[PDB]
Design an enzyme around this catalytic site. Structure first.
Site, short mmCIF file in Angstrom:
data_model
loop_
_atom_site.label_atom_id
_atom_site.label_comp_id
_atom_site.label_asym_id
_atom_site.label_seq_id
_atom_site.Cartn_x
_atom_site.Cartn_y
_atom_site.Cartn_z
N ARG A 123 71.15 73.63 37.63
CA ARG A 123 71.74 72.29 37.65
C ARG A 123 71.00 71.27 38.52
O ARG A 123 70.35 71.61 39.52
CB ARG A 123 73.21 72.43 38.05
CG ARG A 123 73.98 73.23 36.99
CD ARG A 123 75.39 73.55 37.42
NE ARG A 123 76.21 72.34 37.51
CZ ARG A 123 77.36 72.29 38.17
NH1 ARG A 123 77.83 73.38 38.76
NH2 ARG A 123 78.03 71.15 38.27
N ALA A 169 81.74 61.77 41.65
CA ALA A 169 82.48 61.79 42.91
C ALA A 169 81.66 62.63 43.90
O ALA A 169 81.73 62.41 45.10
CB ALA A 169 83.87 62.42 42.70
N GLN A 170 80.87 63.59 43.42
CA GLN A 170 80.07 64.40 44.36
C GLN A 170 78.94 63.62 45.04
O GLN A 170 78.65 63.85 46.22
CB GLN A 170 79.45 65.64 43.67
CG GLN A 170 80.46 66.62 43.17
CD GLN A 170 79.83 67.89 42.62
OE1 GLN A 170 78.64 68.14 42.84
NE2 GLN A 170 80.62 68.70 41.94
N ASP A 321 86.39 67.29 33.57
CA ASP A 321 86.44 68.75 33.48
C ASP A 321 87.42 69.25 32.41
O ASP A 321 87.50 70.45 32.14
CB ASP A 321 86.82 69.34 34.84
CG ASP A 321 85.74 69.11 35.90
OD1 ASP A 321 84.57 68.84 35.53
OD2 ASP A 321 86.06 69.23 37.09
N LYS A 348 76.95 70.54 33.69
CA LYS A 348 77.97 71.29 34.44
C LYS A 348 77.60 72.77 34.55
O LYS A 348 76.43 73.14 34.36
CB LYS A 348 79.34 71.10 33.77
CG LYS A 348 79.80 69.64 33.81
CD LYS A 348 80.11 69.19 35.23
CE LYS A 348 80.49 67.69 35.26
NZ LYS A 348 80.81 67.22 36.65
O1 LIG Z 1 83.93 65.97 43.84
C1 LIG Z 1 84.61 66.86 43.25
O2 LIG Z 1 85.50 67.56 43.79
C2 LIG Z 1 84.27 67.16 41.82
C3 LIG Z 1 83.60 66.18 41.06
C4 LIG Z 1 83.17 66.46 39.63
O3 LIG Z 1 81.70 66.57 39.60
P1 LIG Z 1 80.63 65.26 39.48
O4 LIG Z 1 80.59 64.45 40.76
O5 LIG Z 1 79.27 65.80 39.23
O6 LIG Z 1 81.09 64.41 38.37
C5 LIG Z 1 83.92 67.70 39.01
O7 LIG Z 1 83.32 68.01 37.73
C6 LIG Z 1 83.93 68.90 39.97
O8 LIG Z 1 84.66 70.02 39.40
C7 LIG Z 1 84.61 68.45 41.26
O1 LIG Z 2 85.40 72.81 37.74
C1 LIG Z 2 84.81 72.23 36.81
O2 LIG Z 2 85.28 72.07 35.67
C2 LIG Z 2 83.43 71.69 37.04
N1 LIG Z 2 82.88 72.00 38.39
C3 LIG Z 2 81.54 71.51 38.67
P1 LIG Z 2 80.92 72.05 40.21
O3 LIG Z 2 82.03 72.07 41.19
O4 LIG Z 2 80.36 73.44 39.95
O5 LIG Z 2 79.87 71.08 40.52
#
Ligand SMILES: O=C(O)C1=C[C@@H](OP(=O)(O)O)[C@@H](O)[C@H](O)C1
Ligand SMILES: O=C(O)C[NH2+]CP(=O)(O)O
Length: 445
Positions: A123, A169-170, A321, A348
């Site tokens: 990833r 959001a990450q 998700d 993902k």
């Molecule tokens: O910040 C978080 O808790 C999350 C953000 C999402 O990822 P992205 O920031 O890549 O969209 C989501 O798919 C993941 O399961 C949790």
């Molecule tokens: O839980 C999910 O559907 C996607 N998580 C993405 P990750 O937390 O591995 O970046």
């Protein structure tokens, strides 16, 4: 190595169950509790593998984490107090833990190495490593900015103003966490809203963090760095993404009446419920309340007849998700369901757009996979769906591909088999027991 499982047509699902804790909030509870000054107490924590890996990474940097009764208690190191880890931080399958921790510790003046499993290692990390390079972090990564990655922070990090290029959001979270150990004001500009657990929880921990939203929806998030964080009592709400499995199952399996308790209802997490309601789903929101600083409610779900709908690109961040399980619901809806703005699905745990399309086709569903979209035409009675030969859906180490197709098999004429159920425990170890308790016929082979 792999453990296949098969789901069989079931009689009405029935019961009331408490859904496991929210994964996003659980990751942050371990991280913020581990960083803050003093003690943090957490109830309702998700104990899936992803969260446990984040906890182990925090312990490696000095946090003391233990479980007393049903409460996790953490003695934090204080902001700026993380200790250099002895060995690589192993995030397993967890992108949330990995990316957020890269921001958190990358700005510290010591080396930190990040590794993970076969899925996480493919990833993209560039989305967080780029802003970190701007803040002065030195990065060593594999081609394409993939793991393993080693970061080395500068003596004094540089605060930045960063406009997040995709609805992540990450990335927003990693830049804010990096800002905690950076002098000055770190600003994240989010053109489209994404889940806001970092902002809400950091405010709860005492951070001088503000969010200003323009009438056009753009969010300007400011954080003053090197401020004190104070341990807190956290009550983790039920995971709305995990909730989607028994919820969609109850909508699809005739004769069903399932109530899921204590579900997080933050609007950045409820796009699927909104979409299913537009499709005609019978979902009752009961006793909406405030718990642990978040909106929660109980959801009573009954068998429904669904109709295809258009799911616009701007709704994607609020349900990213949930596309795998929505696609399974669409496979039993009248007419066509079209979903666009799905580029993020391809990066993902698995390329989810490809895995869902292939899984649907293997199980007789008429669907069209686009570069960034999916059209699904349903068969309400489930006739001809599933796979009579017992061919297995390729899960590609993705827990939601495994769970969404097992839900599909509870409704299709022919059973649905997934090639592996081992990864379900990354986010929902209780899945098999919970579904079986409601009456679902799922057998681990
Ligand atoms: O910040 C978080 O808790 C999350 C953000 C999402 O990822 P992205 O920031 O890549 O969209 C989501 O798919 C993941 O399961 C949790
Ligand atoms: O839980 C999910 O559907 C996607 N998580 C993405 P990750 O937390 O591995 O970046």
């Amino acid at each position: 190595s792999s453990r296949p499982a098969t789901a069989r047509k079931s009689s009405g699902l029935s019961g009331t169950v408490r859904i496991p804790g929210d994964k996003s909030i659980s990751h942050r509870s371990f991280m913020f509790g581990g960083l803050a000054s003093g003690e943090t107490r957490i109830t309702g924590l998700l104990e899936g593998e992803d969260v446990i890996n984040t906890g182990k990474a925090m312990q490696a940097m000095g946090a003391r984490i233990r479980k007393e009764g049903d409460t996790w208690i953490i003695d934090g190191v204080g902001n700026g107090g993380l200790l250099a880890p002895e060995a690589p931080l192993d995030f397993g399958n967890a992108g949330t833990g990995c990316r957020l921790t890269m921001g958190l510790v990358g700005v510290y003046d010591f080396d930190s190495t990040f590794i993970g499993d076969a899925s996480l290692t493919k990833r993209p990390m560039g989305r967080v490593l780029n802003p970190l390079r701007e803040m002065g972090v030195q990065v060593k990564s594999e081609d394409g900015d993939r793991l393993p990655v080693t970061l080395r922070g500068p003596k004094t990090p540089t605060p930045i103003t960063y406009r997040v290029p995709m609805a992540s959001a990450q990335v927003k979270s990693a830049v804010l966490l990096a800002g905690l150990n950076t002098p000055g004001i770190t600003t994240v500009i989010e053109p489209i809203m994404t889940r806001d657990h970092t902002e809400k929880m950091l405010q709860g921990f005492g951070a001088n963090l503000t969010v200003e939203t323009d009438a056009d929806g753009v969010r300007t998030i400011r954080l003053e760095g090197r401020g004190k964080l104070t341990g807190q009592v956290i009550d983790v709400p039920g995971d709305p993404s995990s909730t989607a499995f028994p919820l969609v199952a109850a909508l699809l399996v005739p004769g069903s009446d399932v109530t899921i308790l204590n579900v997080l209802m933050n609007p950045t997490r409820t796009g699927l419920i909104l979409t299913l309601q537009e499709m005609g789903a019978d979902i009752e929101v009961i006793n909406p309340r405030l718990a642990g600083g978040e909106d929660v409610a109980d959801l009573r779900v009954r068998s429904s007849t669904l109709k295809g709908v258009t799911v616009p690109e701007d709704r994607a961040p609020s349900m990213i998700d949930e596309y795998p399980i929505l696609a399974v619901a669409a496979a039993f809806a009248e007419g066509a369901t079209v979903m666009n703005g799905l580029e993020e699905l391809r990066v993902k745990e698995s390329d989810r757009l490809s895995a869902v399309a292939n899984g649907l086709k293997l199980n007789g569903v008429d669907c069209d996979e686009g570069e960034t979209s999916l059209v699904v035409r349903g068969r309400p009675d489930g006739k001809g769906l599933g796979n009579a030969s017992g061919a297995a859906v390729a899960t590609h180490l993705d827990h939601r591909i495994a769970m969404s197709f097992l839900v599909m098999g509870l409704v299709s004429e022919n059973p649905v088999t997934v090639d592996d159920a081992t990864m379900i425990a990354t986010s929902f170890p209780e899945f098999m027991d919970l579904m079986a308790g409601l009456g679902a016929k799922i057998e681990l082979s």
